[PDB]
């Protein structure tokens, strides 16, 4: 059994400590190729990501799952470059996020299923690099096209065994509808992570997903604008709940019996052009540890609050492997 990474297949044991929702760069299709100066340069972006993934690896990370799709401007050659230089495995994604272009938005369920299966089974672009996860998104009630996306992701997963991970607007409880669509296609909830679930404190929502077998993506732990004076765009993005508040949802779900269904991540990036200018600077001041925030700050916080080392290892190592390994 093997997981596809940007440097090829790896064994389950090789994945190790895995961050399940991360990005090298949050962009748009074609954007880094057309406007590399937006990032300084392409080399500057590469160097920043290598440095950050090095720091993460020193803190114990072995693999990240880059959940950048086509419409986040995923550049698998950029991921392979960074992966080789930092010695951190990167799993790439297929699927569609919240910014599909017209050439995607006009497609049928069958067509999209073809595209997702191309990326899982054949390769991304002309690279031969295969995705190891399918990423999808809603922000409230699904648009007609997003329902097609969710159905195509389910079809792709059913044919291949690769899991599905989601973006939600957690305040709208989107995982409810997402689950409904997925289940209508026959997808097992154990193949699905409902992401950005740490953006809500609603335990009735979180446990109702976990009770049916979903994995719960508590994937934005360091996202917080607390004590950012009067920066409306950072507040709108990051929220005003503390990282501790978010991290305590890990403990909460442990305490309810769902330790095997928890997936934790930073949802960090090294470049971010699909938001306001200089947001990466703002984010990096909030969390200078970047992708190392989970091991360096979250794990010790949870140990101080009484969570066991063994439970945290199961969450950071066992759960990601179970989720990623195709089934």
Annotated binding site for Zn(2+): 21, 23, 135, 167, 196, 267
- Per-residue interface string for the shown chain with Zn ion, residues 263-282, x marking contact by CB under 5 A: ----x---------------
Minimum gap (Å) between residue 250 Cβ and ligand E8N: 10
Residue nearest to ligand E8N (CB): 311
Task: Give the phi and the psi of residue 164 in degrees, each rounded to 5.
Answer: -120, 135
Residues that bind a second copy (CB under 8 A): 27-31, 33-35, 37-38, 70-71, 73, 99, 101-104, 106-108, 111, 114-115, 118-119, 124-126, 273-277
109, with CB counted inside 10 A (0-12, 13-18, 19+), is middle
Closest by Cα among 178, 127, 125 to 153: 178
Minimum gap (Å) between residue 97 Cβ and Zn ion: 7
Instruction: Give Cβ neighbours of residue 257 (< 8 Å, ≥ 6 apart).
Output: none
Residues 249-308 that bind Cl ion (CB under 5 A): 301
Minimum gap (Å) between residue 126 Cβ and a second copy: 7
Residue 301 touches which of ligand E8N, Zn ion, Cl ion, none (Cβ within 5-8 Å per kind)? Cl ion
Residue 311 touches which of ligand E8N, Cl ion, Zn ion, none (Cβ within 5-8 Å per kind)? ligand E8N
Residue 145 touches which of ligand E8N, a second copy, Cl ion, none (Cβ within 5-8 Å per kind)? none
C-alpha dist (Å) from residue 55 to 14, 41, 51, 267, 282: 19, 21, 6, 16, 19
Residue with tokens 């019996």: 257
What is the spatial distance between Cα 149 and Cα 290, in angstroms, rounded to a whole number?
Answer: 30
What is the spatial distance between Cα 319 and Cα 316, in angstroms, rounded to a whole number?
Answer: 7
């Amino acid at each position: 059994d093997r997981i596809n990474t940007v440097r090829g297949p790896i064994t389950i044991s090789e994945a190790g400590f895995t961050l399940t929702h991360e990005h090298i760069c949050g962009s748009s299709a074609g954007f880094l190729r057309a406007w590399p100066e937006f990032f300084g340069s392409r080399a500057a972006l590469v160097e920043k990501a290598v440095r950050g993934l090095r720091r993460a690896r020193a803190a114990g990370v072995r693999t990240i799952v880059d959940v950048s799709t086509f419409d986040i401007g995923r550049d698998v050659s950029l991921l392979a470059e960074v992966s080789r230089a930092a010695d951190v495995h990167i799993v790439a994604a297929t699927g569609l996020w919240e910014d599909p272009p017209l050439s995607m938005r006009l497609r049928s369920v069958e067509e999209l299923t073809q595209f997702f299966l191309r990326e899982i089974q054949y390769g991304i672009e002309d690279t031969g690099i295969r995705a190891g996860i399918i990423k999808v998104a809603t922000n409230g009630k699904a648009t007609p096209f997003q329902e097609l996306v969710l159905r195509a992701a389910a079809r792709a997963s059913l044919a291949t065994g690769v899991p599905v991970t989601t973006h939600t607007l957690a305040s709208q409880r989107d995982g409810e509808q997402q689950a409904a669509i997925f289940e209508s296609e026959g997808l097992s909830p154990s193949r699905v992570c409902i992401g950005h679930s740490d953006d809500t404190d609603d335990l009735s929502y979180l446990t109702a997903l976990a009770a049916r077998g979903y994995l719960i993506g508590l994937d934005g732990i360091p996202h917080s604008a607390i004590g950012l004076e009067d920066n409306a765009s950072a507040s709108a993005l990051l929220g005003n709940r503390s990282w501790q508040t978010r991290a305590l949802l890990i403990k909460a779900l442990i305490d309810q019996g769902y330790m095997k269904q928890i997936l934790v991540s930073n949802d960090w990036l090294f470049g971010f052009s699909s938001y306001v200018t200089n947001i990466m600077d703002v984010m990096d001041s909030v969390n200078p540890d970047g992708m190392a925030f989970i091991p360096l700050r979250v794990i010790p916080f949870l140990r101080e609050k009484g969570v066991s080392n063994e439970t945290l290892a199961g969450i950071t190592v066992t759960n990601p492997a179970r989720f990623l390994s195709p089934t």
